[PDB]
Amino acid sequence: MDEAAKHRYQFWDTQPVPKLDEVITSHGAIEPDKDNVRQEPYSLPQGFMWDTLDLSDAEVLKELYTLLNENYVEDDDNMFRFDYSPEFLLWALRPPGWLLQWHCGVRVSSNKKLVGFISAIPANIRIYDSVKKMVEINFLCVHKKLRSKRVAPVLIREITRRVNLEGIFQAVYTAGVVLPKPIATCRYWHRSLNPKKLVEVKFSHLSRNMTLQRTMKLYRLPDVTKTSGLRPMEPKDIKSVRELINTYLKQFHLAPVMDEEEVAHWFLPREHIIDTFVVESPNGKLTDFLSFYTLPSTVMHHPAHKSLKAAYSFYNIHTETPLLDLMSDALILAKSKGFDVFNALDLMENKTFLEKLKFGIGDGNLQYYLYNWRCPGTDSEKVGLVLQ
Ligand SMILES: CCCCCCCCCCCCCC(=O)CSCCNC(=O)CCNC(=O)[C@H](O)C(C)(C)COP(=O)(O)OP(=O)(O)OC[C@H]1O[C@@H](n2cnc3c(N)ncnc32)[C@H](O)[C@@H]1OP(=O)(O)O
């Protein structure tokens, strides 16, 4: 509530990362690669065990789903919780280069109840002039009952171990809370697509005084998209999408570098997981693409609705079409698919449209972090990486 004090990074102090608020003017690995690496798993509190989850096993996925449905990311006010679908999880956790030893679970020794999880997946990552093989870390989760018993540092050490085994010594990760040390701090913005449901669910916030009718009328969108050539992406586009994305991403201080197998993984439309629309220039050649992913949230304690449907801006590449025109079509497309809210961070060039497409700013930050790499902290606008 009010209770301002000062934190000691019991776990994070010990780790290869910069001290919170050291001034960094250098570029490089905080420590060199471990040429000899620990081969035995870290010790768990008694009653608990390591499991490598096989998500191909329908019952295991279902357990993982239920763990996260019930114990994953919640907002400040705790009226909302991420409801990552089982298939969304299959998409996010099994890109090209994925290894199963990187799907790390914690289970109750006796009744086998899944109570912990952390995941890693491979990616080539460009920090300023250095493109490094890293992993992206996601889905850290400890069961509500098990909170505050130092289990999160066990999973983090353990995943640090199984990744190090494989010759990776750098990683990237985001979190909504401050740790040592943010490269950058982004802010979520939200765009009402359906302001009535947003109001009844209490997600917004009618700006007193404002009628409902006037709100609905402000966020009014057309029913049909504007850009000539605009259509879903199909397999034949894979090659041109790659080229377009690796070129566009050059301008940003942080960005992945993707091959084609990765391009097909991340961008080919999958219903209720990922949408990608390409702009085909008047002949046949591709000049732009917008994309966005599907992530509903559980509305906790409410009578009317139990789920809020959100679109997350992913990567939007513009060469011919202006960006604000692309994003206007992204909004229209999301609206017409029954989403209630379009969400975007203020990274890349997104600041160039947020205010103009009537996004409003939202609570809390998203910090971006690197593991075992020092570099100065750049602005949101210079961040060209997006994680699920
Ligand atoms: C080269 C490969 C490298 C691989 C790994 C690289 C790094 C990967 C790092 C992972 C990146 C994940 C990316 C990602 O998944 C995206 S951010 C999503 C994180 N998950 C959630 O918010 C789920 C809801 N919360 C929880 O489940 C728990 O509260 C968690 C699991 C967060 C901690 O459960 P707990 O019961 O509340 O905590 P204790 O067991 O008592 O442990 C407390 C220690 O945990 C530190 N902590 C708290 N939140 C953290 C966070 N979000 N990152 C890192 N550390 C975090 C905390 O500062 C303290 O350390 P300190 O004493 O030093 O201050």
Ligand SMILES: [Mg+2]
């Ligand atoms: Mg704990």
